[model samples]
Target chain A: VMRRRIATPEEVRLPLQHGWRREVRIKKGSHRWQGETWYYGPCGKRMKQFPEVIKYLSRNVVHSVRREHFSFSPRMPVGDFFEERDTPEGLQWVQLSAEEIPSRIQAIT
Target chain B: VMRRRIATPEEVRLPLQHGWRREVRIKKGSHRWQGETWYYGPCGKRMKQFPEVIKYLSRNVVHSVRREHFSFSPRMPVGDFFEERDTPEGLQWVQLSAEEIPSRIQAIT
Candidate 1:
C-alpha cells in the first residue's frame, strides 16, 4: 500500500521554480523583436544588453496557462491586443487588453 | 545651376515623420521574443492585441543610427545592456544602458 503526503513549503518551492522557469522560456520563444532571441534564464548576464525587451517580454508574453501555479498572471488579456498611434516619434505601437486600449488611448491622446 | 535651400519647418517635419516611421519598422524586426513578428505599421488596428509589446519595441529596440534625423531616441544606450533580478512575479528582466543598470538595480533592490 502507498500513501501520499502533502508537499512541504520547501519541497513545493523547487518544483514551482522549475515550472516557472520553463514557462518563461516557452513564452520568450513566441515573439520576434530585433535579431536577438530572448528567453528567461537563471543567469542575469544573458539578458544584459536588452533590459527593456526583457521587461516587456516578462510582462507581455504569456508562457503558461496554469493560473494557480504561476505568479505573473499578465492581468491583461493577450490575444489580438495591440494599438497604433501617431506621435512625434512616428506611429507608435501599444500592447493592451481589449478593454484597456480605448481608455488608454483617451488618456494618452 | 541649382542651389540647396534650407527646408521650411513643414517640409522638414514631413520628412522627419517619414524617417521616424521607417526607423520604427526596422527596429521592430531585430528581436525574437515569441512566435510573433512585430514590425511597425501605420494602422492602429494591427497593434490592438499587443500594446505592451508595441510600446516596448518602440522604446527599446534600436533601428537606425541616424541620430539627428529621428525623434524617438531611446536616450539609453543599446548593446550589452541587461539586468536580472528576482521579483515576486519571477525573474524580471530590465533593459538599461550600462551606466544606468547598476544604479537602477541598486534602487530597485
Candidate 2:
C-alpha cells in the first residue's frame, strides 16, 4: 500500500506565490497558539506548495515583487544575484535578466 | 503567575510581513513533509504575528504590493474593500484612504 496523491493547476497555483517574506507573533501571547507564516523562492528554494495557510493564523503587509519561471545558472553571475551593499559601483560582476530581475530585487521582507 | 510575553520591535517586525498572501504542498508529495505558507492582513486580520514561517517550505514567486498600516471602516464601503468584478462601475459606494490604497490592491494570492 503505497499511494495517495493528486494536485495540479500548477500545484493549486503554488501557494498563491508564497507570501513575499514577512511574519511574526503576539496576538496577546502566553502562547497565542504560536503565530506563524513564511516562504521564499526564486532560487531561494523553500517551497513545497503549501495549502492556503494550512490554518496559517498570523499575517499581513507590503512589497514590490515579480518573477516568471526563473532559474539562473547560465554560469551564475550578476554579482551572484545582486546586493553588493544595495548595489552600485560600475556594476562589477553584475548581470541580470529574469526580465532584468524586477529592478534588481526590492522586497525580501 | 502567567506571564511569558516579550516580543516587539513591532513584534519582531511581524513575521517579516506574513508573506503577503500566498501559500502551498507537494514538492513531490507523499508529503514532502507538508508544504505551507500563508498570510493576509490590511483589514483581513488573522495575525498573531507568526515566526518566519515556522519553518515554511514549496514557496516562490511574484507581486506588486505595498501597505503601511491599513484599516478601513467608514462603514465598510469601497465596494467592501474592492473587487466588484475587479471594480469599475457607477461607483455606488467607495471610500479609500490608507494613502489611496496602493493603486487599488494588486496581489492577494
Tens-digit lDDT track of model 1 for A29-48: 23421111222332321232
Superposed Cα deviation of residue A20, candidate 2 (Å): 9.0
Alpha-carbon deviation at A19 in model 2, angstroms: 6.8
Cα misplacement distance, residue B104 of candidate 2 (Å): 30
Residue B77, candidate 2: alpha-carbon lDDT: 18
Candidate 2's DockQ is 0.03
After superposition, the stretches of candidate 2 with alpha carbons farther than 4 Å from their true spots are: A1-68, A71-82, A86-109, B1-5, B14-109
- lDDT (tens digit, per residue) of candidate 2 on B24-67: 21122242222222333321233223442221210211122222
Where does candidate 1 chain B have its weakest 10-residue lDDT segment?
B19-28
- Mark the 10 consecutive residues where model 2 chain A has the least summed lDDT: A55-64
